[PDB]
Amino acid sequence: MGHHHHHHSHMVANPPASKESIDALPEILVTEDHGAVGQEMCCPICCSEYVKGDVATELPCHHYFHKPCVSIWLQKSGTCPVCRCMFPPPL
Ligand SMILES: [Zn+2]
Ligand SMILES: [Zn+2]
Secondary structure, X not given: OOOOOOOOOOOOOOOOOOHHHHHOOOEEEOOOOOOOOOOOOEEXXXXXXXXXXXXXXXXXXXXXXXXHHHHHHHOOOOEOOOOOOEOOOOO
């Protein structure tokens, strides 16, 4: 039920991460035996599936995405799309 649309969440906005902190994340080469990596078979950011050849990574809050796309997202929204937790992780 989306009757009241509070589109802008948070009173204070979350800052974007630095590339250095993202590049330091574990690089997971998506192999052909990996149709899904710790989640669905689809990378929400790309609305596309996981196949051999793409580069995945794991956010410290245990959430997998493609490194290429998450590196841009984290510097744009600085939040894990699935849990809305900040990156780098809050305290
Ligand atoms: Zn992706
Ligand atoms: Zn997360």
